[PDB]
Amino acid sequence: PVPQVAFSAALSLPRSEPGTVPFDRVLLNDGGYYDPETGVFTAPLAGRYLLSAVLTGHRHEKVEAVLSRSNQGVARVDSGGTLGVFSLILPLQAGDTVCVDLVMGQLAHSEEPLTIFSGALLYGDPELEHA
Template sequence: QPQPGISLLPSRPRIQPPRQRTPLQPQQPRPLPRPVLPGAGVVPFLPGTTGIILETGEAGPPGTVLMSGRGRLGSVDGPAAAAAASLVSFSAGLTQKPFSSDVGVVHFNKVLVNDGDYYNPNTGIFTSPYEGRYLITAVLAPERDEYVEAVLSVSNASVAQLHTAGYRRELLEYHKPYSGKRTCGGPGTFHLVLHLKAGDEVNVVVTGGKLAYTDSDEMYSTFSGVLLYPSISHV
């Protein structure tokens, strides 16, 4: 017998209407905070830019201002001192009789440039102070209706020779003396780049003919040289 108040029929479940849910909206990304130095104002973003803007730090101490231009060389040590000491050049002309005899070393007496005082006008000799490459030039002008024969000597060894009247090949090949009449010619020149060692002596030796000279300051013959660059061992 069923007890009163108790139903044996299955109860119907109550169906609840679905709840209306609000769709999730994507959150806008927030810009990262900008670091700000203490006491500094807020730096605004530039239009159309995002990101982090860093503040400029404190200015450093002022640098040393160097003046441009050319000045006198000071005293320095090391390779710079060697380069400064390597400024060597000379140039001299002839305004007097070059030597007492007919031939010999030409004494170019009128000095125009003599950086380092390595050229001696009393002897006509340039002494190389450093090992390196040198440009050596000489212009020899003969007297009218005369010729000049000369050699460029380095430490008593002939490096080059010239003859203002020219050479004949057969005389050079067989070393025959010239017996005919010597014709005159224009000035003769030396123009060479030489490798000189420290202490090498360079001079011009006239072996024949007559050099032109005058008692005035006019120069017809010259002798010059300049150190192009020293050897690596010197630098």
């Protein structure tokens, strides 16, 4: 079959927001699949997919590292301003969910950056089984 799924959204709100930023730029993503408002990414794709996250510089320090399902830790989108970090590929389980850790030092500063999260389907698993 052909899952033909693509997904990508852009954030550009005006100024001071009440908290974290949602996404109003629907560029391409009918099913949505991964809500960037909560970051709860439910990926049924099953296959090989191209993921790309935009890394804010923020040289003021702190450690950003997104959790990865099945191992926790695992920085695929690593930002240092059984466990390893990867960027190109994407070892993800069917239905599993990814979550961002954003807490590595309390005494810090207050800020609200912006981030773009795109990720398009490249190839899906076409059975590929052999009894």
